[PDB]
């Protein structure tokens, strides 16, 4: 399929994370989901104000590139990769792109 | 129309900015465009490596919200708002959301 299935899983996981996160004890900021199936980029963002302090950061950025799931940015506690594996994505189809290219071979995931 | 026209203009402007930016004298990083017409969020991102240093930042984030163009983040030199105005978007339909809500009334743009 396999990219078509990955798109469905990524969007499903980010959407559920966004909803589930509203029950956190930790401070809840306003969030945004940004899914683009043409450029194959998927983001979960915090976009808010704390008085006059701007809250603006990225929880997760995933890109589908080279027929694989490139995790470009991930500040979740357990890691998106853990959830993807639980949903049946093989480690060979996940790239921890938030790690420098030259270290990926020392991990349990694909280099590219 | 008017939101339908705004979507077309935002995507047009971000796509052209991304291409034009490759001719900059300033260091060029790999970039990503992320357009979502269902959540109405549009981003232009830098996503790259400089040796072992992660380059990961947002050039522009726009959201269409409340029937207006909310500029959530903008590190361009002249400002996206300037280009939108040049393309015929009225100042009353642009919100500088990167400014704290309570200061927007002191600007030339909408508060909300």
UniProtKB/TrEMBL annotation, chains A, B:
<protein>
    <submittedName>
        <fullName>XisI protein-like protein</fullName>
    </submittedName>
</protein>
<dbReference type="Pfam" id="PF08869">
    <property type="entry name" value="XisI"/>
</dbReference>
<dbReference type="InterPro" id="IPR035943">
    <property type="entry name" value="XisI-like_sf"/>
</dbReference>
<dbReference type="InterPro" id="IPR014968">
    <property type="entry name" value="XisI"/>
</dbReference>
């Amino acid at each position: 399929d396999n990219v078509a299935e990955y798109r469905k899983l990524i969007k499903q996981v980010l959407t559920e994370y966004d909803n589930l996160s509203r029950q956190s004890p930790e401070t809840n900021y306003e969030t945004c989901l940004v899914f683009d199936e043409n450029h194959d980029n998927y983001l979960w963002l915090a976009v808010d104000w704390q008085g006059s302090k701007r809250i603006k950061y990225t929880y997760v950025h995933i890109r589908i590139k080279n027929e694989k799931i490139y995790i470009e940015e991930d500040y979740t506690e357990e890691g998106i990769a853990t959830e993807l594996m639980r949903l049946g994505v093989t480690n060979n189809d996940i790239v921890l792109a938030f790690h420098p290219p030259d270290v990926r071979k020392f991990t349990d995931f694909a280099t590219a």
